[PDB]
Design a protein around this nucleic acid. Structure first.
Ligand SMILES: [Mg+2]
Ligand SMILES: [Mg+2]
Ligand SMILES: [Mg+2]
Ligand SMILES: [Mg+2]
Ligand SMILES: [Mg+2]
Ligand SMILES: [Mg+2]
Ligand SMILES: [Mg+2]
Ligand SMILES: [Mg+2]
Ligand SMILES: [Mg+2]
Ligand SMILES: [Mg+2]
Ligand SMILES: [Mg+2]
Ligand SMILES: [Mg+2]
Ligand SMILES: [Mg+2]
Ligand SMILES: [Mg+2]
Ligand SMILES: [Mg+2]
Ligand SMILES: [Mg+2]
Ligand SMILES: [Mg+2]
Ligand SMILES: [Mg+2]
Ligand SMILES: [Mg+2]
Ligand SMILES: [Mg+2]
Ligand SMILES: [Mg+2]
Ligand SMILES: [Mg+2]
Ligand SMILES: [Mg+2]
Ligand SMILES: [Mg+2]
Ligand SMILES: [Mg+2]
Ligand SMILES: [Mg+2]
Lengths: 165, 48, 174, 288, 186, 318, 269
RNA sequence: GUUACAGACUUAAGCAGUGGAGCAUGUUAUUUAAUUCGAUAAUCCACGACUAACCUUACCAUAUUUUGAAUAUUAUAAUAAUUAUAAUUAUUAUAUUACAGGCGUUACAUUGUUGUCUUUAGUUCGUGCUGCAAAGUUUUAGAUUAAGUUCAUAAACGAACAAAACUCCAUAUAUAUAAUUUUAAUUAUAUAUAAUUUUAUAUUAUUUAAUAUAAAGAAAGGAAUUAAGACAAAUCAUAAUGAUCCUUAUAAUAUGGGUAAUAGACGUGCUAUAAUAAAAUGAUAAUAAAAUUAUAUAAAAUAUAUUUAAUUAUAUUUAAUUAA
């Protein structure tokens, strides 16, 4: 039995709730910023850490949270406050998301192959193989450096031993 | 599943104030105690 | 809950007899006592044809029946080309054959789903409904013939333990 | 219906006035407004939603889905009592119900309904006594089905006495209640000389039991089988001698003795009337 | 009874209004999936209502066909395989389609929808962007600056009269404003 | 004829007369048959979410029992949680039971536990859950004053707390108490009254429509359509399930010290048929297509010295 | 202010109930990290006249929580009979649904009209200038791997090409170009993000256009349009190409307008 | 190892099969280092097992692990997060016992669940009444229904778990929605209404009930639900738990083998034994439904088998869509 306190809707209140994939350029930047904040482990989806609780300031977002292979139990690392908090905000990620920049690998030229192997037909075959690999690896999603390494291995520019590390 | 999930161990870490009781564990302990009492406890493990 | 059928029948008898009193001689009191115990049309289109949708099994047949000289077109092709079995054609004809109006009505059938015999049956069903609009007095006759009844016969599902709907796997007493 | 701003302000609060104005601007005057049959967005009663209800809307400080508050702020720090109690009238009692020695009172009330008997009398003046308290069973296809059998003399201690038996598959308390009920239904005025003993030396057979009950001089107590004694205590007999022969089946004793009292006895006055004679009591005349 | 119930209340009580479609430029379609109806239909109705307030011509809950994921199982834990039980799961699907809206309004709508979402209902959005054939991401810094200005215009506090505010959104805006963010590309 | 057409167009009301619908106070949402109220387009993710939810339930159960310096062990009974997965946020919720103005000045163990769920600024349980789901979580406890309003709680409580009353055999007093929870409500009468009330409401709305009326199907203003219809009158009468009509509780297993064999012991009260569906427009519906809506069945299986046993409970709710 | 519980020094002049509420808040917020205060104690003592508790007793309770209460001082009342003052589980669920409905009605009434402030008229990009349609998809609550999928789609006649170049473009497209509807579309899922994929698609389109406009020692005038994929697709689908014969129509047999006199009388406007 | 009736896929017709043949699969027996364990009358035998190469697996041979998967107790030390070079916490490491673990044994210790009697019509409780009483009546004269199902008659009157009904699928109609390019509007899906159908004329038996006829209707099925008790029916190999036994072994990991062995026997199937029946062919591609496709569905097209090509099978390479 009381009056309805009408808090007015605003674009700012509906920020965060904006679609992660929306055509607009303005929206893309915002989405990127949100992603960067999430990566930093900003209090989104949760109440913030301020200078009130001192001991129990725990977090679960450690370097390998929901993962098995790193041998540990649940690690309650202390969170920073809202002050003294850094944001990652990397350039490569920005390039990927905001603009539509992609690496595409590099096609291996015939000259490089000639450096190692002698015969011409064999070199041409190796080049063809490398080309075949390239398109497949572009299609697949793995990781910038790892994918490149794999591509090199497939080509024969690097040996098999470099994978097993 | 997600291996990092909250357990009873943590429910002491997060909330020390509340003296929780894990019932299944307590039951197991009681059973062990009973076994010890009536000469049906586990034999001592070999080391070598 | 204590009301019995016999009691109800008696009550009805009592009311009916009272009601039967010649309306001119009836009283106000009697009528007051009895007071307690009381209590879309299809047409042709712009172009003068009667649309009707019939169904059987999985089949559905939307059929445009029109007053022009009796020719058939099933699903955008000739009747003998579509329905190879003469039985299906005979079935289709039957609504026009119970009436003396095969040759009177042009029919443009459009079927979908099911197999051929079921499709033909659905078309027939649709045609009967279409005919009913042209002359409502024949509706009873069509119903009697057994064309206005939607044939419900629906394929029974395979039940778990059974092989087919009813076909069970062999029993073994020993 | 497009109302003026001042009128709206008079009936509606200052927060929603702007929203109302906006709604008026957006939605035209010429509007059809269809009735959505296949889905109902709004409630089945009229309500201007300006006032938040205590029970029928969400509690403001409490957390839930559709909270519309921050993760920190939830004004609800005591969970001992219930958060949203029932609106208007506190109860949800149906029509014709009420909220919750007592057993005896309930019995008396039930008797008053069924047979017009005075409840207050039943509660106070009548006092009961169990005579037999069997557990009893029937061999059913399900199995052996046990049943608690009671047999309970009730009696105002002024010659008004009744026997009653009762039975329940559920525990013996219910069986005893039933026996008590039966006893009060079967209350019976026994005749007795000087309000203390039977008139003559009676000798009565009820089925197996052969009863013999002698009258007694005043002061000489109840000197009889325990069932008989129990019945006499309730029925107001102070003085009695007697002995049971043949069967001594407790139930049949209890049934037989009340029958003997009601039937085998003749009051002196009745005898006098029948015979047409004076029938004096010599002791009374003497004055002891 | 001398109690003026204004038009918004009336609209709530009746079925939801729909604005007409000027041009068939399907901007976005929103599919709503759920494992039941009652919540889903309500949610769709709410979406329609909010879409009305905005200029956009949302069509309406076109029911796409329900799925049926069946699974059979022997009832017993051991043998009795002649007795078997079925199980089913119906993915109920409804379609909304927005027809004429400047992207920002559409975004706002979608954001509003996801804010006050209901329990059982999942959602998917297909947005459509009618772009020209030839494009250029060369004249970059100026275009970034323009985008930032547009964002600032969008998220400006007109009158702080106890309006709805978000901390994360404010932070995002601050980040967008910063010199470091401007630097990123070059 | 026009007036009749207009009425037909607008003819809707709460179901339950003899143009009507089951309102949200007259039946359960089928979403409230399942415990993980979710749809996701990627089914792997949905599966992962429901696993998480199940794991959280166990954690909550574990939390629910407290200790007070090894003096008192107050076992708060909780229902099975129901997890509401909106696009924005999860909301976990459960019903719970706990067994002069002196306690305004110290926090009870139960109170502390409840505070932990949402109120501890950084430290709270909801915050920690949010990491597993990647969305804001809200745990809402709901207190039940009686043991027998929720079926799960009733069964659970009997399994955990009242061991001594049935371990040898069901004590007589305890059995009597179980029998006489409710006051033997004439369920037929209540259902009939409810139906009559619904009819009266329908008549009232119809009467109002007639009064308004004295190609477009718009009637008068809202105030005049819903003339006598208010929050005070209608909602509580329309509210479907309110009255525990009948209930059955079964104890089963090795609940006999002398005997080696098992013992099925059943307590039955009232009725499990509903007479609101028998003679009216409102129809019965089936939860997971096999449990009559009004019913709610549950069991909970505590281990004894002798071995395993369980306690089925089944309530009717008119 | 909101941050009031944190400062126990400030609240002595408040009413007793308010003080109690603040105390409860303080206890809640720092559950395990609670540490008693003198000012807070004094406030609690001052409040004591509100709820009937003596001054020593309140202090004792403050010092020792539940243990103190126990020292100051029960029967099991689990199956105590129903006093008709609390709804069951199903009932409570129905109530909650009704609360939700009411909330949504309120939102519709007073927040959606507010939302109409943020309203813009449609600013149409013309089909002549903007023929291509990059459709993006987004799954709201989930993180689907199809959110990266972007689909370009254009009518080939709407592209700025000469006739020879258009044919060459169509030939290059192969399966991507449908011929019944003059539409060429293609989707990319190769890259991590949606924007990347869109950019890649755009680059492909540009490359295709460049190839079409070359004509230097490569015309493709004498390679007919391969329409096998389209006919296969058509076969897979069904067709309803047939129509009612136009010469079978009978406008004369159609139902004529029946004269309604009362309706005519009514129509005075 | 009894009486009397009534019932249906019980029997009788009828249609197609099994029993003969070969193969598949399960079982038995025997074999084997191991052929893992259970199910084994109806109520086992393509059953547990909706796929045994490795895995799964539990079995066997040979190797090698010994606080091991947990929880708690007690100590040393190292790294990372947080704060304003110290400290608080969280973890890890090495140990330290209680133990952990056990598809080991007993469903004749249990749970839950299931099979059969069983969609069979039974199973009980109040208040009253009868009998000294255990008990009986209610819950049945006689009939009827699919039916403790309605009639009727009756010391009974009500009430419960079953039955029926509400439920789901399918059907008919109406309304709503779908800018009829996600179209199939001949549709899909929410919400209703509809029937356990109604009415009347007659002909037999006693106001009704079966047959027939007629006029009114789209009006005709399937699924789920299988009570109480019983069978110490099945399951400790889904899982859990009691008791009991193993603890450098009955626990744990790898490499291979086995579960696929074959005299006879037993079920279930598959393919057959040719002309009321088999094979080639049939591109303005004769006519379906239901369901699956981000641990993917793979179109067109090229190449080889194959002198044309089609067919069928692979390879080449991924167009389209994560889906009316
Ligand atoms: Mg008697
Ligand atoms: Mg036969
Ligand atoms: Mg043979
Ligand atoms: Mg054979
Ligand atoms: Mg075997
Ligand atoms: Mg066995
Ligand atoms: Mg079989
Ligand atoms: Mg192995
Ligand atoms: Mg083993
Ligand atoms: Mg053990
Ligand atoms: Mg069992
Ligand atoms: Mg019988
Ligand atoms: Mg009997
Ligand atoms: Mg179409
Ligand atoms: Mg049934
Ligand atoms: Mg049974
Ligand atoms: Mg057994
Ligand atoms: Mg056995
Ligand atoms: Mg065991
Ligand atoms: Mg075994
Ligand atoms: Mg096990
Ligand atoms: Mg071993
Ligand atoms: Mg085998
Ligand atoms: Mg042949
Ligand atoms: Mg063909
Ligand atoms: Mg192909």
């Amino acid at each position: 039995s009381s009056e309805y306190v009408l808090e007015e809707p605003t674009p700012l209140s509906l920020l965060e709730y904006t679609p992660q994939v929306f055509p607009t350029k303005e929206s893309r930047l915002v989405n990127f910023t949100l992603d960067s904040l999430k990566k930093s482990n900003y209090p989104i989806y949760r109440s913030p850490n301020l200078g009130i609780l001192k001991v129990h300031d725990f977090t679960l977002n450690t370097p390998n949270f929901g993962k098995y292979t790193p041998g540990s139990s649940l690690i309650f690392a202390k969170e920073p406050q809202l002050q003294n908090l850094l944001i990652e905000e990397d350039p490569e990620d920005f390039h990927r998301q905001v603009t539509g920049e992609y690496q595409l690998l590099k096609p291996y030229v015939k000259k490089d192959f000639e450096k190692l192997t002698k015969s011409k037909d064999t070199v041409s075959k190796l080049v063809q193989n490398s080309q075949v690999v390239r398109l497949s690896l572009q299609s697949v999603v793995m990781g910038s450096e790892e994918k490149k390494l794999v591509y090199d291995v497939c080509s024969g520019m690097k040996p098999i031993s470099e994978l097993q590390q | 599943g997600n291996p990092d999930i909250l357990k009873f161990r943590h429910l002491k870490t997060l909330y020390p104030d509340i003296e929780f009781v894990d019932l299944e564990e307590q039951y197991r302990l009681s059973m062990v105690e009973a076994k010890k009492r009536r000469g049906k406890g586990a034999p001592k493990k070999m080391k070598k | 809950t204590k009301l019995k059928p016999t009691q109800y029948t008696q009550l009805l008898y009592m009311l009916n007899k009272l009601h039967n009193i010649d309306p001119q001689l009836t009283n106000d009191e009697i009528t007051s006592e009895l007071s307690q115990y009381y209590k879309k049309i299809k047409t042709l289109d712009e172009f003068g044809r009667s649309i009707a949708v019939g169904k059987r099994k999985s089949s559905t047949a939307k059929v445009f029946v029109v007053r022009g000289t009796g020719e058939i077109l099933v699903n955008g092709r000739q009747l003998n080309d579509y329905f190879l079995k003469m039985k299906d054609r005979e079935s289709i004809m039957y609504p026009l054959q119970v009436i003396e109006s095969v040759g009177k009505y042009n029919i443009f059938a459009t079927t979908s789903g099911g197999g051929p015999t079921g499709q033909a049956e659905s078309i027939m069903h649709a045609i009967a409904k279409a005919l009913v609009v042209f002359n409502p007095l024949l509706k009873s006759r069509l119903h009697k013939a057994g064309v206005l009844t939607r044939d419900y016969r629906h394929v029974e599902r395979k039940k778990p333990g059974k092989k087919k709907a009813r076909k069970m796997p062999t029993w073994v007493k020993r | 219906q497009h109302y003026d701003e001042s009128l709206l302000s008079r009936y509606y609060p200052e927060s929603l006035l702007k929203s109302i104005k906006l709604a008026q601007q957006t939605i035209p005057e010429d509007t059809k407004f269809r009735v959505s049959r296949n889905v109902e967005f709004a409630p089945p009663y009229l309500d201007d939603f300006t006032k938040i209800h205590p029970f029928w809307d969400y509690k403001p400080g409490m957390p839930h889905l559709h909270a519309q508050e921050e993760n920190n702020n939830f004004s609800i720090f005591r969970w001992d009592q219930v958060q949203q109690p029932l609106p208007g009238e506190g109860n949800i009692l149906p029509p014709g119900v009420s909220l919750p020695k007592s057993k005896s009172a309930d019995v008396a009330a039930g008797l008053h309904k069924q047979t017009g008997v005075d409840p207050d009398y039943i509660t106070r003046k009548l006092t009961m006594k169990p005579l037999v308290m069997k557990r009893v069973s029937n061999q059913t296809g399900k199995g052996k089905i046990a049943s608690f059998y009671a047999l309970v003399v009730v009696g105002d201690k002024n010659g008004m006495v009744g026997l009653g038996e009762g039975k329940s598959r559920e525990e013996m308390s219910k069986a005893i209640f039933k026996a008590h009920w039966d006893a009060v239904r079967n209350l019976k005025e026994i005749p007795r000389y000087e309000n203390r003993t039977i008139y003559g030396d009676i000798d009565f057979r009820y089925h197996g039991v052969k009863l013999h009950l002698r009258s007694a001089k005043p002061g000489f107590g109840l000197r009889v089988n325990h069932v008989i004694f129990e019945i006499c205590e309730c029925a107001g007999i102070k003085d009695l001698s007697g002995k049971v022969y043949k069967s001594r089946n407790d139930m049949n004793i209890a049934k037989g003795t009340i029958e003997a009292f009601t039937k085998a006895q003749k009051t002196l006055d009745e005898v006098a009337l029948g015979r047409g004679k004076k029938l004096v009591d010599v002791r009374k005349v003497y004055y002891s | 009874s001398t109690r003026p119930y204004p038009v918004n209340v009336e609209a709530v009580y009746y079925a939801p209004l729909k604005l007409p479609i000027k041009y068939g430029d399907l901007v976005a379609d929103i599919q709503l999936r759920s494992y039941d109806n009652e919540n889903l239909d309500f949610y769709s109705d709410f979406i329609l209502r909010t879409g009305y307030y905005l200029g956009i011509p949302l069509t309406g809950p076109k029911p796409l066909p329900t799925r049926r994921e069946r699974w059979t199982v022997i009832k017993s834990p051991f043998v009795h395989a002649k007795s078997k039980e079925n199980f089913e799961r119906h993915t109920h699907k409804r379609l909304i389609r927005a027809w004429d809206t400047n992207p920002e309004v559409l975004q706002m709508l979608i954001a509003y929808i996801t804010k006050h979402s209901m329990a059982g209902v999942g959602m998917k959005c297909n947005f459509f962007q009618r772009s020209e054939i030839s494009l250029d991401l060369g004249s970059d810094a100026n275009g970034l600056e323009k985008s930032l200005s547009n964002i600032d215009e969008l998220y400006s506090l007109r009158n702080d009269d106890k309006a709805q505010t978000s901390a994360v959104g404010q932070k995002v805006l601050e980040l967008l404003d910063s010199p470091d963010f401007k630097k990123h590309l070059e | 004829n026009n007036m009749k057409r207009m009425l037909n167009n607008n003819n809707m009301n709460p179901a339950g007369a003899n143009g009507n619908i089951n309102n949200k106070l007259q039946h359960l949402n089928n979403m409230n048959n399942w415990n993980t109220q979710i749809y996701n387009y990627n089914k792997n993710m949905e599966i992962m979410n429901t696993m998480n939810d199940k794991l959280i339930n166990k954690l909550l159960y574990k939390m629910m029992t407290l200790k007070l310096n090894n003096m008192n062990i107050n076992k708060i009974i909780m229902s099975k949680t129901i997890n509401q997965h909106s696009l924005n946020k999860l909301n976990i919720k459960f019903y719970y039971y706990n067994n002069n103005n002196n306690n305004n000045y110290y926090m009870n163990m139960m109170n502390k536990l409840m505070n932990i769920m949402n109120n501890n600024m950084n430290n709270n349980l909801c915050n920690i859950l949010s990491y597993y789901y990647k969305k804001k979580v809200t745990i809402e406890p709901i207190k039940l004053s009686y043991i027998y309003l929720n079926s799960d709680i009733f069964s659970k409580y009997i399994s955990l707390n009242d061991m001594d009353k049935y371990n040898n055999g069901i004590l007589t007093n305890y059995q009597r108490m179980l029998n006489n929870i409710m006051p033997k409500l004439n369920d037929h009468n209540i259902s009939m009254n409810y139906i009559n009330n619904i009819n009266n409401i329908n008549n009232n709305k119809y009467n109002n429509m007639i009064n308004l009326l004295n190609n477009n199907n718009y009637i008068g203003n809202i105030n005049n359509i819903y003339n006598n219809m208010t929050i005070d009158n209608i909602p509580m009468d329309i509210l479907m399930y309110k009255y525990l009509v009948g209930w059955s509780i079964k104890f089963k297993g090795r609940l006999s010290n002398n005997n080696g064999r098992t013992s099925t012991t059943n307590l039955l009260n009232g009725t499990f048929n509903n007479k609101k569906y028998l003679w009216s427009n409102i129809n019965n519906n089936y939860k997971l297509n096999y449990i009559p809506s009004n019913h709610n069945l549950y069991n909970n299986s505590n281990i004894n010295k002798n071995g395993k046993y369980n306690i089925k409970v089944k309530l009717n709710f008119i | 202010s909101a941050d009031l519980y944190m400062h126990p020094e400030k609240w002595k002049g408040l009413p007793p109930q308010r003080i109690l509420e603040l105390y409860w808040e303080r206890m809640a917020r720092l559950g395990s990290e609670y540490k008693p205060n003198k000012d807070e104690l004094n406030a609690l003592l001052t409040t004591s006249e509100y709820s009937n508790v003596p001054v020593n007793d309140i202090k004792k309770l403050y010092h020792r929580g539940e243990q103190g209460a126990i020292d100051i001082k029960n029967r099991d009342n689990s199956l105590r009979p129903f006093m008709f003052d609390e709804l069951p589980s199903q009932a409570q669920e129905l109530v909650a649904q009704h609360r939700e409905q009411r909330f949504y009605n309120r939102l519709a009434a007073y927040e959606l009209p507010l939302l109409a402030q943020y309203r813009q008229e449609y600013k149409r990009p013309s089909p002549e200038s903007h023929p291509v349609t990059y459709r993006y998809t987004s799954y709201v609550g989930e993180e689907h791997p199809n959110s990266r999928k972007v689909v370009l789609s254009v009518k080939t006649k709407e592209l700025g090409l000469e006739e020879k170049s258009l044919h060459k473009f169509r030939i290059l497209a192969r399966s991507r170009y449908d011929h019944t509807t003059d539409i060429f579309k293609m989707s990319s899922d190769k890259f991590e993000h949606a924007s990347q994929n869109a950019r890649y698609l755009h680059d492909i389109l540009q490359r295709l256009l460049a190839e079409s406009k070359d004509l230097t020692e490569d015309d493709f005038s004498d390679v007919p349009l391969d329409t096998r994929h389209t006919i296969a697709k058509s076969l897979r689908k069904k067709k309803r190409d047939y129509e009612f014969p136009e010469h079978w129509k009978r406008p004369e047999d159609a139902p004529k307008k029946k004269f309604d006199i009362v309706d005519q009388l009514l129509s005075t406007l």
